[PDB]
Amino acid sequence: VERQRFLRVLQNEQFELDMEEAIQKAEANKMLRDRQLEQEERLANELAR
Amino acid sequence: NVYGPGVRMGNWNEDVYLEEERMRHFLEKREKGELLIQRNRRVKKNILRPMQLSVSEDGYVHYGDKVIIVNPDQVEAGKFMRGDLSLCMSPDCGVSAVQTIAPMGRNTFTILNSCEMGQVVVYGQNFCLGIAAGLEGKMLYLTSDHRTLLKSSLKSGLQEVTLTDEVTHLNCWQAAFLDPQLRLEYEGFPVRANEKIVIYHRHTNRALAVHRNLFLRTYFGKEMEVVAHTYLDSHKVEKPKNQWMLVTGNP
Amino acid sequence: CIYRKEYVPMPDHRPDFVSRWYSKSKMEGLPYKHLITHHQEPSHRYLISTYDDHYNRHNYNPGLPALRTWNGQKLLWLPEKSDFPLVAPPTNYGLLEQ
Amino acid sequence: MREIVHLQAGQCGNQIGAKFWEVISDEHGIDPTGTYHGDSDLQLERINVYYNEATGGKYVPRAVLVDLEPGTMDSVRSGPFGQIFRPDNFVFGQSGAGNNWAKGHYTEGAELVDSVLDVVRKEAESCDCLQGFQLTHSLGGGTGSGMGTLLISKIREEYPDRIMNTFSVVPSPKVSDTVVEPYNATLSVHQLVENTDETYCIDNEALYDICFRTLKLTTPTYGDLNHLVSATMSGVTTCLRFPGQLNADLRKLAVNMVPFPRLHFFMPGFAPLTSRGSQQYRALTVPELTQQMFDAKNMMAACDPRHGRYLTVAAVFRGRMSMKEVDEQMLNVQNKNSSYFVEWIPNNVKTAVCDIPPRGLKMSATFIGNSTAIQELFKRISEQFTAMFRRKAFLHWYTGEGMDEMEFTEAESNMNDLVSEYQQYQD
Amino acid sequence: IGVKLSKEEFENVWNLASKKHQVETIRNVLDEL
Amino acid sequence: MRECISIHVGQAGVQIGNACWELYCLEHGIQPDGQMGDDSFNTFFSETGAGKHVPRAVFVDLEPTVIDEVRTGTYRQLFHPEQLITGKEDAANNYARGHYTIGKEIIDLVLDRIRKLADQCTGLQGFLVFHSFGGGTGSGFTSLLMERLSVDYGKKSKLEFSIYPAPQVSTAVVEPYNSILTTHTTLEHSDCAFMVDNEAIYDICRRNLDIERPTYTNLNRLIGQIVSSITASLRFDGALNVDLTEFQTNLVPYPRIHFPLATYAPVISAEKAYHEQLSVAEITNACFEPANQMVKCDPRHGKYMACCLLYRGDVVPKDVNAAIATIKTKRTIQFVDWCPTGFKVGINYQPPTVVPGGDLAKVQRAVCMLSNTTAIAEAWARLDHKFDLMYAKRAFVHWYVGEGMEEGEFSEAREDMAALEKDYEEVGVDSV
Secondary structure, X not given: OHXXXXXXXXXXXXXXXXXXXXXXXXXXXXXXXXXXXXXXXXXXXXXXX | OOOOOOOXXXXXXXXXXXHHHHHHHHHHHHHHOOOHHHHHHHHHHHHOOOOXXXXXXXXXXXXXXXXXXXXXXXXXXXXXXXXXXXXXXXXXXXXXXXXXXXXXXXXXXXXXOOOOOOOEOEOOOOEOEEEOOOOOOOOEEEEOOOOOOOOOOOOOOOEOOEEEOOOOOOOOEEEEEOOOOOOOOXXXXXXXXXXXXXXXXXXXXXXXXXXXXXXXXXXXXOOOEEEEOOOEOOOOOEOOOOEEEOOOOOO | OHHHXXXXXXXXXXXXXHHHHHHHHHHOOOOHHHHOOOOOOOOOOOOOOXXXXXXXXXXXXXXXXXXXXXXXXXOOOHHHHXXXXXOOOOOOOOOOOO | OOEEEEEEOHHHHOOOHHXXXXXXXXXXXEOOOOOEOOOOOOOOOOHHHOOEEOHHHOEEOXXXXXXXXXXXXXXXXXXXXXXXXXXXXXXXXXXXXOOOOHHHHOOOOOOOHHHOHHHHHHHOOOOOOEXXXXXXXXXXXXXXXXXXXXXXXXXXXXXXXXXXXXXXXXXXXXXXXXXXXXXXXXXXXXXXXXXXXXXXXXXXXXXXXXHHHHOOOOOOOHHHHHHHHHHHXXXXXXXXXXXXXXXXXOOHHHHHHOOOOOOOEOEEEOOOOXXXXXXXXXXXXHHHHHHHHXXXXXXXXXXXHHHOOEEXXXXXEOOOOOOHHHOOHHHHHHHOOHHHEOOOOOOOEOOOOOOOOOEOEOOOEOOEEEEOOHHHOOHHHHHHHHHHHOOOOOHHHOOOOOOOOOOOOOOOHHHHHHHHHHOOXXX | OOOOOOHHHHHHHHHHHHHHXXXXXXXXXXXXX | OOOOOEEEEHHHHHHHXXXXXXXXXXXXXXXXXXXXXOOOOOOOEOOOOOOOOOEOOEEEOOOXXXXXXXXXXXXXXXXXXXXXXXXXXXXXXXXXHHHXXXXXHHHHHHHHHHHHHHHHXXXXXXXXXXXXXXXXXXXXXXXXXXXXXXXXXXXXXXXXXXEOOOOOOOOOOOHHHHHHHHHHHHHHHOOEEEEEOOHHHHHHHHHOOOOOOOOHHHHHHHHHHHHHHHHXXXXXXXXXXXXXXXXXXXXXXXXXXXXXXXXXXXXXXXXXXXXXXXXXHHHHXXXXXXXXXXOXXXXXXXXXXXXXXXXXXXXXXXXXXXXXXXXXXXXXXXEOOOOOOOOOEEXXXXXXXXXXXXXXXXXXEEEEEEEEXXXXXXXXXXXXXXXXXXXXXXXXXXXXXXXXXXOOHHHHHHXXXXXXXXXXXXXXXXXX
8 A cells, every 4th residue: 555655755755846846936036027028128218208 | 966857968978868768758759648647538538538418308307318327424433435436437347435426428328128208217127327438439338236345345344336348237236225114105106306215236236335434546546445334223213324316408 | 839830831832743754855865766876878678689689680770881981080890890789679589478 | 490598596696687588678668567579570570588488478487586684685576677576486484694614505495495495386387498507696595595505405406417507606805894704705615516517607796897997987886886796697508598690508618618527617707898088989890809808808707718728718709790701700719829728629709600699789709718717716814714713703603503623624725735736737 | 107006906006005194115015025 | 482571670770661651552553542564573572362462561659750651641551550650658769678578568569560461471581770870769779679589580581771960060969979879789790781872862862963952751761772773673564673682692702891881863853854865874974073962971082883874764775785895994983992893783664653752853763773883881981980079078978878778789889890990901901
């Protein structure tokens, strides 16, 4: 019992960890970059105007 | 002495190649769909399908009526499952009893020597109980054979009950009354929907039981044992272990 | 008293199950045991025998049937020797059927 | 064309044969549910060598799987390969021996021998034609060295005709793991000489080199190190299981390697090793495999082979190759340095061929050697032995369950006269 | 500035900014709520 | 099915087993009212039909205030009604009362419940005694039981965690007599005598954990963790597990050497753990510094004889070989000639579970050394020295003669200590 259960369980662990962390980190970074950049752009341009 | 994953110190390069190939293989497996997550979620979604029962135009049961099999809560030993266990297909297939009360598609039995697809059911008369796995579209059947020296149940070693594809006479059950001085007066009466009636086989004359005392750890976590052995007391009436109820959906 | 002080019960100090299960594969490494000894390029079916290739098979098919061209830098007549034939499916002869 | 009976014991051997009985499952295309889902009809040829049959087409091994502790038998059938091993081929007690040889060889490891002896003749008489007996264990404790090297004296009582081959684990020189090693190492070496024929010596200091200096990892562990030993095993008998050019076997290997009734201690190797970064930058051909299998850094024992000589050298090959490039590079390496071979024998290196490497390799080899710098592994034990016997330390674990001092002082007079044989022929 | 806002959301943002004050106020109220 | 029937003798035994069985009911799912994957809680926890686990060990005190405080505490529904044994009178700092009268009056219910536990078990390895050299119940009742059990159950492992009196500072006046007498009557019926102190743990609880003014209840959990990383090998899985026989067969060379010293390496608090780096090397070099011993002795005046590194947690098994290899290249760590191997390593992977809101943090790598040293003969020299000053006046001896035992035990209990230190001096020399 323990064997099968924990085997399947930790396989799940590893796969999930990998995929989830990678995707989330990438998304966060790119999105944050884009938002900050565009916001700064529009605000500075309008203030100058 | 030893640092983390990303900083460019020591033996980083061969390990960068190592998690590069492992990360790419894991993404290939997820893209193809050979991972335990998506296979398991697809299986469990095709089992736990929220589907609908059939209400009854009177109290009585007819054939073709999509009817749950459930065993009532009982008030003998100190190992116990709390209340209203139901009969569920537990694959690995197998059969057991689970703590649920909703029709979810591994619960739902269709009532199948009678002929018409709608016909009133009576005590002491043979019928069959049908269930279907997802996308198979072929009728399974509730079965149990005369006990042999190699065919015994899992935890208890009594007569076992299982599911099979084939058609035989080891598939026909008949349901009687628990009060033992009135069943010969009840041999032909129609059966009401939610009433406590014994279930017995027709070839063995044994009866389907629920063992609330030994547990079957499954993936779903809900636990009991099913078998077929008729139980009687010192007053020689049937115990609360053997009572079964074939409930229908509410209107 | 100090016994009745300190021995107040704790409902909800559930022990973890996870660090033990992860140290198990920290030592073991379950899918890792072909990532240790596999070499070159991943490949599922690569394997065939010498009687079946040279005799019954009649040899490589997509290669040069006659030409053996002598190259520039390395001093060699390769395009027959360099193939080391690996064509087609492996040695099947009808035993899995029986 | 035989079958193979393979014995396993100790806390070691079921963590080594766990990797051994799954490379054989890999090379014959055996899934861990019991059946066969390989690709060719070549693998199915000599499936009988390692796999008896039953109903439904499933193949279960010839496994013998014994240990006093139930510590590791909960771990071998809780692996990926758990329904491939036999149910009634787990034989155990309840207690654990743990570093003594009295209660392995005479009392506590001994009452289960009649529960290993009567499982062998259930299967090893049902096999139609056996080649002999294999064993893998560690000399360092009390269940391999206590039961298996006891049973090695027991099964050679029945059949003298067959061939004993061993996969032993001598203790490491520098950093050891038990204070009572040079008794259990001492007494089982004197056991091994009379009743074993090709004894293979394996170390973990010599394998923590290879996963560090050669293959360039940063966390070498046991599972990373058990598999290079379990690569050797299926790289040994490659010709009783597959066709080729020049087939060899465990009786072909003994004739070309051991000359003598007593000079029968060996030293192994395994050729094609590299990193994970330089996987495509190497060319797996014969001028690369031969260049490293003779080197000291690619050796699985505590041997500096330059300090002595090889009296004899074995080999095997696999893979679709040609023969001239394996005819001259083992002719050059006998020629380029006559300092590292002895002169009175005219040939040294035996050549054997197969057709198929292990799955994933392209071409393969497995170095097997009878050097006389293997006597630098049995000098440190006899240095550690009598510098403990002189203070008579720890001897009341060794009088307390049935042994004497006369089982002691004659268990070094075998180790002395062994080294007194290997030093005659050194130059 | 790249933000598509409902009319009721703009009225609520102005109300929350006036409640926050005895741009910084508008950006802070839009970030918090 | 590898139980450890443990004994707790005296005020010391019950007051340390409170925290020890606290940790055993802590690390599993065991509630403090009997109720509740792994099934390695059946090595200390039986069953019934209600899932109710009841611990399999014996607690004895003739001075029933601590036992009644347990019986009325929070841990009443869990312990058995019978394996907690009281009297109505204490031995009160003498060997005579505990060994001849108050031991004799109530040794039989102890031996009854030991036989009931030992024949309800299936897989007992040995006996583990927690007792006190410096009192009345922990010395007389102790040696009476360790005669009355070694006469019955014969050859079996016997390990004694012993709350030894302190080197300089003290609590009761006439501890030299009641130390020396029970040592002479324990040496012939011991197998391994692990030794701990109290001020030597006060020093470490001041200088490592930075908590000032601690109690016995803050000292007790360090022994309560020491015993748990001692017994952890049966408790969970691992790479190289340890039965009970390997301590007793790896740690003592001779008939009368058996007195090892205990030490426990990674001692630090919660506010400091997150900023210190728990390296294997720094742990094993802290565990050899003589400021980190549980016994106040200096190892530089003598030679080691045998060690036992018992790990726990996320061991990297290459790094343990590297750590022992860099230990072995020092001259401040000395060894005798006859032990050239001189080490043992045991392994388990489960991390140490630490009590909620304690003085310790969630360590991930636990190390216990149970090594023996010839610099415990220096510790025995002082309790022979005090006896030499005291017996010459014949002080205090009437308390000893007035309950049955003669005065002629007092000469042999010094001749025994003289021959024991003769043994310890003749073993640690070189032969040439």
